[PDB]
Amino acid sequence: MPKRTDIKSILILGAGPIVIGQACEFDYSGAQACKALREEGYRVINVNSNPATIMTDPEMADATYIEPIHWEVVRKIIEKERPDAVLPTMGGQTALNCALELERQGVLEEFGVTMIGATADAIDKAEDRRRFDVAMKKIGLETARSGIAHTMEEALAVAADVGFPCIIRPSFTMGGSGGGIAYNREEFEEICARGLDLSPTKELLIDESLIGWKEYEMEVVRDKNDNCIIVCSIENFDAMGIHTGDSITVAPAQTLTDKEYQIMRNASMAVLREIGVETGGSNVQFAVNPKNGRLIVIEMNPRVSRSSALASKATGFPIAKVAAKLAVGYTLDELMNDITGGRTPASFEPSIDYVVTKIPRFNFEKFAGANDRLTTQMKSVGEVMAIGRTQQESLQKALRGLEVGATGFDPKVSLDDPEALTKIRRELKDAGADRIWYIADAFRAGLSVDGVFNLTNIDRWFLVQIEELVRLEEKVAEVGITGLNADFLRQLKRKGFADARLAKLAGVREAEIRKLRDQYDLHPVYKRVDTCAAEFATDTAYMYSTYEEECEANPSTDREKIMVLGGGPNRIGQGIEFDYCCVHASLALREDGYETIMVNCNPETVSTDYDTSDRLYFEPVTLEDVLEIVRIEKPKGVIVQYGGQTPLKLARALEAAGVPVIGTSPDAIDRAEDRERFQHAVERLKLKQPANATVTAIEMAVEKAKEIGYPLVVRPAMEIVYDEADLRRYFQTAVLLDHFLDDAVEVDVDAICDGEMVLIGGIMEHIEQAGVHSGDSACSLPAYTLSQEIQDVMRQQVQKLAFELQVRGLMNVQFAVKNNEVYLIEVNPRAARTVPFVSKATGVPLAKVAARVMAGKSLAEQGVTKEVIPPYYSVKEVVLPFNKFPGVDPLLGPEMRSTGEVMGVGRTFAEAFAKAQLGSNSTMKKHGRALLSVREGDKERVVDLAAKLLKQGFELDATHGTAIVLGEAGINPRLVNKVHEGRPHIQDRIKNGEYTYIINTTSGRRAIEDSRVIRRSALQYKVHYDTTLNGGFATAMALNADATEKVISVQEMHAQIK
Amino acid sequence: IKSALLVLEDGTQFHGRAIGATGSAVGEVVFNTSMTGYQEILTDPSYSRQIVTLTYPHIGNVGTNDADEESSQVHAQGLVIRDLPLIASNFRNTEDLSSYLKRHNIVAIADIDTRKLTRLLREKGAQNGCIIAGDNPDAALALEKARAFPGLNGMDLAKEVTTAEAYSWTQGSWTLTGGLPQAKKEDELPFHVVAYDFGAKRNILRMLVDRGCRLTIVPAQTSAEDVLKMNPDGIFLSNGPGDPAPCDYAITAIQKFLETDIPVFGICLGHQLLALASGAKTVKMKFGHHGGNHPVKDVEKNVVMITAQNHGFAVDEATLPANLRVTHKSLFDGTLQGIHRTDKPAFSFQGHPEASPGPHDAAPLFDHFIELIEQYRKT
């Protein structure tokens, strides 16, 4: 019953870099699992290619491997660590897939590695959709009419059977990856082909449609004693047909009668029992026909998930921590429930006295030709969560914490737009990311709840509530600010209305509304999360705001408090890297003696883990919400610099509102952000900035362009213009003008300044040139080409800026190196997304460090004075979401689009590079035929590359112009035709798998537009491709290395530093 | 504005809105953590004279229906909730919450901080209270009424809810497919069990019926003698409101059954009576157990069950006759939950094996009873 004695060491399989459908929730869960295994005295080993993870923190485990999550690499790790067992349920699907690969490869046997948590058979029984369907039938549970298909032939026969629309679901995939809904044969063929090739078992399940049915999930937990509990139930706001991850969801279930609930409860347990999960958690999904409660089982995920993370956050029941321990022999009855001071067991079902709401976060605006309608395949990049005593209150708070500019139910369309009812119908009928706001707009427009129901299939239970908010809004707009008496205002507040939204309606500033509340003594109270609807006391301070009577905050007067502001839901550009920083500040200052208060509402993160801080306020990171907490906490200092843009934008207002914002001042930041202020400072210091201008009108810019000289960087969707025509061109389709620095090397420098000194955190050299957004660039630390000399100037420029700007904590500076001359791109007086990377490479926890500095402790005092220059090479590479948005051109540019990153460690840049590349899921091969099709400027350089490959034994192909230059060089590639040139053309060859590598460079808007085909084909076909010559060079380099040769632990690496 | 007010014995006031009938309600105030099951809960006789506070904010999401009534009527004295939803939204709904409440003439209040009430009841223990619903609800009056409330300790509530005459019960459990079944024919039931109606829940009966028992429901005060005359295959002791202790007749009759080899089974109040009739003592719990996520361990098998609880009194374990073995215990608080006569075919359970609402985890408890029955007939 107690802990297993035959096991001493455990290998935990991490999730890898963040992708759509597989995000932060895995760092939260993995960190939990580590903590729980380390706590219990086990030897902890883990692999995880993502460096921006807390789980990869050195102190969190015994042996930490930031290596490519490749079965061959995992095998070395195993061979080297000889872990007794492997826990594969905490790293998403990557972990599931890997575990089963190692097993299949016989590695597990080879080193006597016992699979705990979930057995390979249980995992397959659940992941293989054929098996899952069988299982259901065995236990008499109902499933939709479906058919297995291993080929397109197989598939089409099913479609003929089930009819359109039909749902396509691959075996061994999650987050709807490779799936979709097919409305026609053409869509069908497309999804299936993608799914078949994506499925690790090359299998698809195709099901008849249940679209519009109610969709539910249940998070279950079972022990070796067969003890089994339902930790949380979830009702999706968006019906069957929209993936749960792309759905607005609430806990608990709302519209099920107890009778139906029990049926579902029993079914859930039956599911785990039949699949065979006996020592861990699992997510079980269902579809319910609202007209007759008909229950249908959809799937089950034999591991922790995005929903378990949500459930954990929602209930206060740390599923992963508990599951980790269950994996090692403990039973639920023996574990204590954390939040109830451990005065109650883990063996119980949580009861909550509030409503939890989750809203997905999308970023369609970054994906040009992407289809933006929601379907079974996830497209969201993040999520927000909120808690309120009521559904209305919970939903509105979430909306205002979504970080999209909503203050609640802001209108999308105008009332006096004749066409409105048309746009509205459309937005309802076929949901996009904006649907929530359209629902409100529909009600404003005269649509009934039934009308809305019929188009969205969203339960009227939810609809009626949104309609009510609307009618209330109308009242507000009607009575205006004078009509805002304390009674009415309190009603509003209690319904979740934001000051901002009332402000807008009443036609006043938001501060006006806050003043009113101040006048009325209208403030929220804080309730605590406890897992038991208050039946048992809590010693934990995990709270949410609400408009009720009794407050449970009970702030402390005893200590010096420090508040840390999170970034809300994750989005492209505002990822986990920021949370990571946030987490660190808390851990750091807490450790140091401060009472740490964390403010955030991303349910996937470690920062929203009660254990991360002294006090956790799971709130919207807004001025309103933050000021209310400050009102009562009366902290000593607030950190606004670590959660990204969200908290940064608030800085000014907070400070003005009286908040003791610490570290780099709001004004200092503004000095840097503000184009004008910055430029002006740069000057003052006499440094290099690219020639720029601020234009108003077209012709204004044509002339100014003339001045600055081409090519230009036009910022309004930022594009690079190369000529007058091009400029003009953009203008129609369309103000900042900046001279583009072609063939330049982009550098990133992270550093800390205590006003007394400046600490160089790290100088990273971008593989991709300036022009490819730093966020989407691979990078190297230390620099792999840059001269020392040039590196010294930067260091020097950094220091001047640090002081001049009055940095107090972290900063990041971006440089461009053109012709041995250094230019200043921008200054980021805050923590950058490169911070976790640098910390991992150098061994220094910059976030911790800068945190202390902001809190009054100098670098000197800390004992962190010298810049670390590692004895090894660390390479950062990114992962892009293109595969999720097939209609987009999978090409790099000045706008960031990556969702995650990986780290590669090596004795040589080539080693580090090869590791980073493999880790990024590259499909690059060591042999085959490479295709070369480069732009003019790349024409010269490409010869060497073509030479390197030949050397490597590759055979070459080339488009006309490229072949010209090659032949003129003695390199006679095989000629291939452009699509428009006829057969045999690149498209065909690609599709026919003639290449293992592609180097494709293009410059110019139409030129790109025209060559779209090759990149899309490359992506669809799985051919590794580079879109930059630099990338191409690095790739060639990596050809000489073996990423599965040597493995190293972070601990080891760290110990190599002098 | 339809006003309503709730006042506690201690003077604590809760201002909200009326969602039920017009008037006043007085009783002991309790809190129940069930997130689903409101109708069943209100309709459970064990709640008679109690004012029920629901900790789960939205109460009424699924409206109501007959199949979800655990008894002939609403026994709860009053209902206290946080939020009455705009609409009932469930295929099984036949009438919205408020309307049901009004039809059942129940005083109910919404829009109050149920969490603060919960925490208050948790920390200070149960309290008597009064809810006044009307134009100008008097706070002093309310407090008077609450203070006046005689209290549940020493209060026999079984004789108040019991049936008038005896009767047969042959209806089984509900199913999603066919709803509530047609009462079976008497020849369709191998076994014949006599159930003392101490304010029995319909689910208990139905479940027994599912197990082959034809039932004879008898008034709470029936004599062992009268019973025995019926040659019962088994004797069952229902759940119910109030204090068990004051129920001398029940205790008396049971003791009698305990002379015989007749199988005896009890649930909740039944469990307590059985303990009393056996020499054990009963106590009043600080605030009791009212919810459906309550972990109870089967000490013998070392297995945990998630159970439905509804009790304010408990059997003191340190007063248990040696003929009384502990069979189950609360994982929440260590309180006694199950017992078994070491010397007789008699056992009972503190929780509600028949759930309704709640988890089905404790249903096997019924099977031991059937076991006993089967064996007694062998003999």
Ligand SMILES: Nc1ncnc2c1ncn2[C@@H]1O[C@H](COP(=O)(O)OP(=O)(O)O)[C@@H](O)[C@H]1O
């Ligand atoms: N027959 C069906 N009809 C309609 N929608 C369905 C059907 N089966 C599944 N779905 C939808 O597809 C989504 C993803 O399916 P799921 O089985 O959960 O796969 P994944 O493992 O990728 O998450 C569900 O959350 C649901 O909205």
Ligand SMILES: Nc1ncnc2c1ncn2[C@@H]1O[C@H](COP(=O)(O)OP(=O)(O)O)[C@@H](O)[C@H]1O
């Ligand atoms: N003048 C320029 N010359 C060359 N590359 C540039 C120039 N300005 C910006 N870039 C490129 O565009 C990217 C984004 O520019 P930046 O000003 O840093 O925007 P953001 O606010 O998104 O960081 C850089 O990482 C870089 O590759």
Ligand SMILES: O=c1[nH]cnc2c1ncn2[C@@H]1O[C@H](COP(=O)(O)O)[C@@H](O)[C@H]1O
């Ligand atoms: O099928 C195609 N259609 C259009 N352009 C293409 C195609 N394949 C490659 N290219 C582009 O052709 C360029 C190289 O042209 P080359 O100079 O004739 O070799 C690159 O900028 C490629 O993106």
Ligand SMILES: CC[N+](CC)(CC)CC
């Ligand atoms: C979802 C994560 N992947 C599948 C497990 C696809 C990028 C990693 C290979």
Ligand SMILES: NCCC[C@H](N)C(=O)O
């Ligand atoms: N909310 C702050 C104090 C918490 C207290 N131990 C309780 O559970 O009532």
Ligand SMILES: NCCC[C@H](N)C(=O)O
């Ligand atoms: N760091 C971006 C990934 C590189 C990709 N293969 C490309 O060259 O487009």
Ligand SMILES: [Cl-]
């Ligand atoms: Cl996947």
Ligand SMILES: [Cl-]
């Ligand atoms: Cl149906």
Ligand SMILES: [Cl-]
């Ligand atoms: Cl797309």
Ligand SMILES: [K+]
């Ligand atoms: K082993």
Ligand SMILES: [K+]
């Ligand atoms: K699955």
Ligand SMILES: [K+]
């Ligand atoms: K859904």
Ligand SMILES: [K+]
């Ligand atoms: K799910």
Ligand SMILES: [K+]
């Ligand atoms: K770059």
Ligand SMILES: [K+]
């Ligand atoms: K920036």
Ligand SMILES: [K+]
């Ligand atoms: K109130």
